[PDB]
PDB file of C-alpha atoms and ligand atoms in Angstrom:
ATOM      1  CA  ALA A   1    -123.013-106.929 275.139  1.00 25.76           C
ATOM      2  CA  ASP A   2    -120.626-105.869 272.434  1.00 24.05           C
ATOM      3  CA  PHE A   3    -118.240-103.323 272.069  1.00 24.21           C
ATOM      4  CA  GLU A   4    -115.968-101.741 269.517  1.00 23.74           C
ATOM      5  CA  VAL A   5    -112.265-100.415 270.034  1.00 23.97           C
ATOM      6  CA  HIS A   6    -110.939 -98.439 266.664  1.00 25.27           C
ATOM      7  CA  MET A   7    -107.488 -98.339 265.830  1.00 25.98           C
ATOM      8  CA  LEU A   8    -106.920 -93.976 264.549  1.00 26.70           C
ATOM      9  CA  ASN A   9    -103.284 -92.878 263.563  1.00 26.17           C
ATOM     10  CA  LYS A  10    -104.059 -89.652 265.437  1.00 25.52           C
ATOM     11  CA  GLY A  11    -106.251 -88.919 268.758  1.00 23.41           C
ATOM     12  CA  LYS A  12    -106.536 -86.181 271.274  1.00 25.26           C
ATOM     13  CA  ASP A  13    -103.783 -87.926 272.827  1.00 27.77           C
ATOM     14  CA  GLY A  14    -101.781 -86.944 269.406  1.00 30.63           C
ATOM     15  CA  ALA A  15    -100.459 -89.882 267.707  1.00 29.88           C
ATOM     16  CA  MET A  16    -101.319 -94.078 267.640  1.00 27.69           C
ATOM     17  CA  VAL A  17    -104.682 -94.605 269.790  1.00 25.48           C
ATOM     18  CA  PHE A  18    -107.703 -97.084 270.588  1.00 29.14           C
ATOM     19  CA  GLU A  19    -110.637 -95.188 270.512  1.00 27.26           C
ATOM     20  CA  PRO A  20    -112.005 -95.235 273.657  1.00 26.78           C
ATOM     21  CA  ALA A  21    -108.250 -96.596 275.096  1.00 30.10           C
ATOM     22  CA  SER A  22    -110.676 -97.426 278.385  1.00 30.69           C
ATOM     23  CA  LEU A  23    -112.955-100.290 278.743  1.00 28.22           C
ATOM     24  CA  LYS A  24    -114.992-101.452 281.531  1.00 24.81           C
ATOM     25  CA  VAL A  25    -116.966-104.366 280.845  1.00 26.07           C
ATOM     26  CA  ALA A  26    -118.940-107.334 282.636  1.00 25.76           C
ATOM     27  CA  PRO A  27    -117.548-110.812 282.691  1.00 26.04           C
ATOM     28  CA  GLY A  28    -118.497-112.023 279.256  1.00 25.24           C
ATOM     29  CA  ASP A  29    -118.858-108.755 277.738  1.00 27.15           C
ATOM     30  CA  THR A  30    -116.792-108.920 274.445  1.00 27.43           C
ATOM     31  CA  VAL A  31    -114.519-106.445 272.569  1.00 26.92           C
ATOM     32  CA  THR A  32    -113.994-106.347 268.758  1.00 23.68           C
ATOM     33  CA  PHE A  33    -110.816-103.894 267.774  1.00 25.71           C
ATOM     34  CA  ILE A  34    -111.208-102.798 264.365  1.00 25.33           C
ATOM     35  CA  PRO A  35    -108.500-100.912 262.423  1.00 24.53           C
ATOM     36  CA  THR A  36    -109.872 -97.611 261.436  1.00 22.34           C
ATOM     37  CA  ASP A  37    -106.343 -96.337 259.648  1.00 21.23           C
ATOM     38  CA  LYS A  38    -104.001 -99.864 258.202  1.00 19.07           C
ATOM     39  CA  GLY A  39    -101.171-100.648 259.989  1.00 20.54           C
ATOM     40  CA  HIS A  40    -102.562-101.072 263.624  1.00 21.76           C
ATOM     41  CA  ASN A  41    -102.922-104.614 265.523  1.00 25.11           C
ATOM     42  CA  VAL A  42    -104.370-105.036 268.559  1.00 25.90           C
ATOM     43  CA  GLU A  43    -102.127-107.321 271.684  1.00 23.42           C
ATOM     44  CA  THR A  44    -101.599-107.910 275.093  1.00 20.43           C
ATOM     45  CA  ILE A  45     -99.171-106.414 277.129  1.00 18.35           C
ATOM     46  CA  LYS A  46     -97.040-108.754 279.079  1.00 19.18           C
ATOM     47  CA  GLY A  47     -97.779-109.661 282.030  1.00 19.04           C
ATOM     48  CA  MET A  48    -100.765-107.016 281.988  1.00 20.10           C
ATOM     49  CA  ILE A  49    -103.377-109.411 282.423  1.00 18.50           C
ATOM     50  CA  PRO A  50    -105.449-110.942 285.095  1.00 19.91           C
ATOM     51  CA  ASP A  51    -105.325-114.217 286.240  1.00 22.43           C
ATOM     52  CA  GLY A  52    -107.313-116.889 284.162  1.00 23.76           C
ATOM     53  CA  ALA A  53    -106.852-114.637 281.714  1.00 23.59           C
ATOM     54  CA  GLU A  54    -105.092-116.009 277.891  1.00 23.34           C
ATOM     55  CA  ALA A  55    -102.843-113.682 276.047  1.00 22.36           C
ATOM     56  CA  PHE A  56    -103.762-112.350 272.628  1.00 22.60           C
ATOM     57  CA  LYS A  57    -102.407-111.006 269.385  1.00 22.78           C
ATOM     58  CA  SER A  58    -104.357-109.870 266.570  1.00 22.08           C
ATOM     59  CA  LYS A  59    -102.585-109.225 262.871  1.00 19.12           C
ATOM     60  CA  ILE A  60    -101.599-105.833 260.897  1.00 18.58           C
ATOM     61  CA  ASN A  61    -105.372-104.577 259.870  1.00 15.69           C
ATOM     62  CA  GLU A  62    -107.336-107.963 260.712  1.00 14.29           C
ATOM     63  CA  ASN A  63    -110.896-107.065 262.960  1.00 14.26           C
ATOM     64  CA  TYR A  64    -110.551-108.968 266.105  1.00 14.00           C
ATOM     65  CA  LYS A  65    -113.088-109.487 268.529  1.00 16.01           C
ATOM     66  CA  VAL A  66    -112.286-110.576 272.407  1.00 16.48           C
ATOM     67  CA  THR A  67    -114.018-112.374 275.012  1.00 13.53           C
ATOM     68  CA  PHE A  68    -112.919-111.020 278.418  1.00 14.20           C
ATOM     69  CA  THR A  69    -114.461-113.011 281.754  1.00 15.37           C
ATOM     70  CA  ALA A  70    -111.986-113.502 284.282  1.00 14.39           C
ATOM     71  CA  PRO A  71    -111.961-110.404 286.543  1.00 11.76           C
ATOM     72  CA  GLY A  72    -108.895-107.424 286.786  1.00 13.94           C
ATOM     73  CA  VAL A  73    -107.288-105.000 284.216  1.00 18.70           C
ATOM     74  CA  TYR A  74    -105.785-106.125 280.631  1.00 17.17           C
ATOM     75  CA  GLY A  75    -103.564-103.661 278.981  1.00 14.95           C
ATOM     76  CA  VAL A  76    -103.582-103.898 275.360  1.00 17.59           C
ATOM     77  CA  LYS A  77    -100.834-102.262 272.982  1.00 18.22           C
ATOM     78  CA  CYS A  78    -100.467-101.900 269.367  1.00 17.27           C
ATOM     79  CA  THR A  79     -97.218-103.458 268.288  1.00 17.42           C
ATOM     80  CA  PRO A  80     -95.731-101.086 265.390  1.00 17.31           C
ATOM     81  CA  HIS A  81     -96.910 -98.048 267.241  1.00 18.74           C
ATOM     82  CA  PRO A  82     -94.879 -97.811 270.717  1.00 18.71           C
ATOM     83  CA  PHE A  83     -97.096 -95.081 272.324  1.00 19.33           C
ATOM     84  CA  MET A  84    -100.328 -97.027 271.675  1.00 16.01           C
ATOM     85  CA  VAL A  85    -102.009 -98.662 273.988  1.00 19.33           C
ATOM     86  CA  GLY A  86    -105.442 -99.023 276.252  1.00 19.69           C
ATOM     87  CA  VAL A  87    -106.941-101.083 278.955  1.00 18.12           C
ATOM     88  CA  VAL A  88    -109.919-103.095 279.239  1.00 16.19           C
ATOM     89  CA  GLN A  89    -111.651-103.675 282.724  1.00 13.79           C
ATOM     90  CA  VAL A  90    -113.633-106.733 283.953  1.00 14.38           C
ATOM     91  CA  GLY A  91    -115.928-105.861 286.839  1.00 16.55           C
ATOM     92  CA  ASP A  92    -115.087-103.800 290.138  1.00 21.87           C
ATOM     93  CA  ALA A  93    -112.199-103.601 292.441  1.00 22.60           C
ATOM     94  CA  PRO A  94    -109.759-105.077 290.068  1.00 23.81           C
ATOM     95  CA  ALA A  95    -107.191-107.448 291.807  1.00 21.67           C
ATOM     96  CA  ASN A  96    -103.702-106.277 289.550  1.00 22.96           C
ATOM     97  CA  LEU A  97    -103.943-102.970 289.656  1.00 21.60           C
ATOM     98  CA  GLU A  98    -100.280-102.499 290.137  1.00 20.30           C
ATOM     99  CA  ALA A  99     -99.332-104.747 286.897  1.00 20.38           C
ATOM    100  CA  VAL A 100    -100.226-101.984 284.428  1.00 21.59           C
ATOM    101  CA  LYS A 101     -99.489 -98.564 287.332  1.00 24.70           C
ATOM    102  CA  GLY A 102     -95.857-100.118 288.480  1.00 24.06           C
ATOM    103  CA  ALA A 103     -95.242-100.367 284.896  1.00 20.42           C
ATOM    104  CA  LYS A 104     -92.258 -98.886 283.621  1.00 23.57           C
ATOM    105  CA  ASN A 105     -93.129 -97.984 280.022  1.00 23.84           C
ATOM    106  CA  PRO A 106     -91.977 -95.371 277.604  1.00 23.96           C
ATOM    107  CA  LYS A 107     -93.559 -92.384 279.579  1.00 23.63           C
ATOM    108  CA  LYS A 108     -96.164 -91.320 276.629  1.00 23.18           C
ATOM    109  CA  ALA A 109     -97.086 -94.988 277.021  1.00 21.92           C
ATOM    110  CA  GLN A 110     -97.465 -95.659 280.683  1.00 22.16           C
ATOM    111  CA  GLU A 111     -99.433 -92.240 280.958  1.00 26.25           C
ATOM    112  CA  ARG A 112    -102.289 -93.350 278.509  1.00 26.69           C
ATOM    113  CA  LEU A 113    -102.348 -96.596 280.856  1.00 29.56           C
ATOM    114  CA  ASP A 114    -102.543 -94.601 284.312  1.00 30.09           C
ATOM    115  CA  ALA A 115    -105.157 -92.146 282.246  1.00 29.64           C
ATOM    116  CA  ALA A 116    -106.969 -95.139 281.472  1.00 27.71           C
ATOM    117  CA  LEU A 117    -107.177 -96.218 284.445  1.00 29.47           C
ATOM    118  CA  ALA A 118    -107.860 -93.965 286.394  1.00 28.45           C
ATOM    119  CA  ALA A 119    -110.761 -93.184 283.408  1.00 30.34           C
ATOM    120  CA  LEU A 120    -112.141 -96.610 284.774  1.00 31.42           C
ATOM    121  CA  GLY A 121    -112.536 -95.317 288.687  1.00 30.26           C
ATOM    122  CA  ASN A 122    -109.221 -96.709 290.166  1.00 27.57           C
TER     123      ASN A 122
HETATM  124 CL1  LIG B 201    -109.980-109.451 259.458  1.00 27.74          CL
HETATM  125 CU1  LIG B 202    -101.106 -99.154 266.297  1.00 24.37          CU
END
């Protein structure tokens, strides 16, 4: 299955959001990150992807597709926008949950990450 996440200047959260900010997928599913507004990209957060996964970064304004196979959670962010974060989960029972939760990010970023994990049933 293929999923799309859009990058928007405004959400129910406030400024700068991935929509949806959380997605649970099966191994081998894909997500394409699609800027709706200009000035956004996507990249994995340092330390916040599973063993077996590779890091990634898109260019500003680029449509960017990623295939997720390694099981676990994947914290993603948008470079120019500090609060703009999201979580992709592959499978149930992710093993690197504490890598996202135990992080010490700006409050707003951390609450968005924590909310994403909780919405994923963790
Ligand atoms: Cl593009
Ligand atoms: Cu952004």
